[PDB]
Amino acid sequence: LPGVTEEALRLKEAALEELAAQEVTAPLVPLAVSAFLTSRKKAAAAELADWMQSPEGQASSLESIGRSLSRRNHGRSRAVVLAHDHDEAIKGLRAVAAGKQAPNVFSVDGPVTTGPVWVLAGFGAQHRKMGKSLYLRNEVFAAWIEKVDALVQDELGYSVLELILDDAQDYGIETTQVTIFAIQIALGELLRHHGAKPAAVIGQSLGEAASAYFAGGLSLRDATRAICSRSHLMGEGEAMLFGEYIRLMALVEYSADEIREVFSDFPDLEVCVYAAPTQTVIGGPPEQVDAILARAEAEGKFARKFATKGASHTSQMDPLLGELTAELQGIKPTSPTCGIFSTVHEGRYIKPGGEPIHDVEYWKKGLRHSVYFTHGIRNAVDSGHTTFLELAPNPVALMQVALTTADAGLHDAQLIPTLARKQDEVSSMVSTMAQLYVYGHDLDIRTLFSRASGPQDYANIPP
Numbered sequence: 001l002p003g004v005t006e007e008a009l010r011l012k013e014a015a016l017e018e019l020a021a022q023e024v025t026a027p028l029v030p031l032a033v034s035a036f037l038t039s040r041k042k043a044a045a046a047e048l049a050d051w052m053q054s055p056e057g058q059a060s061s062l063e064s065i066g067r068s069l070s071r072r073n074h075g076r077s078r079a080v081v082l083a084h085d086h087d088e089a090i091k092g093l094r095a096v097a098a099g100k101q102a103p104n105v106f107s108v109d110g111p112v113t114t115g116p117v118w119v120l121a122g123f124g125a126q127h128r129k130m131g132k133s134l135y136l137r138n139e140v141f142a143a144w145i146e147k148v149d150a151l152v153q154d155e156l157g158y159s160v161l162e163l164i165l166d167d168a169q170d171y172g173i174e175t176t177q178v179t180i181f182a183i184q185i186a187l188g189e190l191l192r193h194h195g196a197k198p199a200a201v202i203g204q205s206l207g208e209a210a211s212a213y214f215a216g217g218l219s220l221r222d223a224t225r226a227i228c229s230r231s232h233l234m235g236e237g238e239a240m241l242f243g244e245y246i247r248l249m250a251l252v253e254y255s256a257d258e259i260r261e262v263f264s265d266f267p268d269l270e271v272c273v274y275a276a277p278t279q280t281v282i283g284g285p286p287e288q289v290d291a292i293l294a295r296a297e298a299e300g301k302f303a304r305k306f307a308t309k310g311a312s313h314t315s316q317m318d319p320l321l322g323e324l325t326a327e328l329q330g331i332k333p334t335s336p337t338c339g340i341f342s343t344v345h346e347g348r349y350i351k352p353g354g355e356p357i358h359d360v361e362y363w364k365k366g367l368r369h370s371v372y373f374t375h376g377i378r379n380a381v382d383s384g385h386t387t388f389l390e391l392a393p394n395p396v397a398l399m400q401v402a403l404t405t406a407d408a409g410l411h412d413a414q415l416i417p418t419l420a421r422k423q424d425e426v427s428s429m430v431s432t433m434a435q436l437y438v439y440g441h442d443l444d445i446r447t448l449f450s451r452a453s454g455p456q457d458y459a460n461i462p463p
């Protein structure tokens, strides 16, 4: 396998140079508090805040306090205050104490019943600097990026890391896919590193490759093969599209049943994505695409044309299917080591230990056919899931998950983002992991702090 390219090393040197010269912002510190009883939890938050108001407490670094907190027994009733300084922490703890809500405070009476679903989508989520910050500041994250970087170099001949590190480089159809995949793989292994794991995975479109890997349905290598193949064929295919060959994609706020109706006016439109229960992404000849939009606006419905000259998940894709078959020959579909809600196979569930689904044909069917995303999520809700965690550079899919959950009578779900444009990426992950903790999912909160060197790494937190 190829190593990290000299150009990446150069860009990295310059990135760390830029980084060294920034004003140093206060880290986000997760402060855990638990008990068998909420009432005990509440009072413990009270004592802890009281003491933090005191000189001894005021003299103890938030980090040292959180470290000690992370070493207590973690009860059924859990809370986390996310804080940058003592005041934020004290204010936050008062909330926990009063049982009141606040943005930086999470507090639940008992652990969530069922394990989390990992949502891996990616469309719409890309942005200039995605994953650069976390790449420079998290070794685990970084090591995983470099592993996908190396594999993509092998399959395609270029370095995804270079794209991440180079502020002047923007993303196209092909490079979005492989890079968002890189970030997805890396976020999920970071999450695994801290002891977290998915109960089930669901893929959306682009994200199906990462979902396959995390569900243990394919090795990293083959999953990389899967995203690489589709990406370049799609990216190279759409660049060649002009005039009468062009096919647009567009989100319209119509349900599946509204579409059956609406479509009788447009004979060449197809469904790309059933995104939400009244949000559908369609595709076809640009005049028809323009007309379904015009008629959406004439009804006060949301409608958004995508930046592309070709429609994935439509008949247009047929000519690619042959080369796709050939380029994926040899991949080894394995048996899922967790649940998969397959949005390719109509949102249906596959059981851990079930038969392999990720065969060459699956990728062929994935690209050709509709993405049943709202049905997947609905399936998940119905069978008990309430925690949906999205591995993305921007939590765009959670916006869809929200509409499906609400529609299904689940009015409070645990919708957990990861990275977000214009949010600190380290703070982001600390918050993700804090949530997993508070809802009582697997997460070794001890790992959010480094091994203590001396006794100053601890705090005299009240009994």
Ligand SMILES: *[C@@H](O)[C@H](CCCCCCCCCCCCCC)C(=O)O
Residues within 6 Å of the ligand: 121, 122, 123, 173, 204, 205, 206, 207, 233, 234, 235, 237, 238, 241, 308, 309, 310, 311, 312, 313, 316, 317, 319, 320
């Ligand atoms: C899912 O997120 C993702 C959607 C990305 C949109 C890319 C546009 C599709 C490209 C069209 C290629 C034209 C090929 C030429 C045929 C002759 C997805 O991967 O589906």
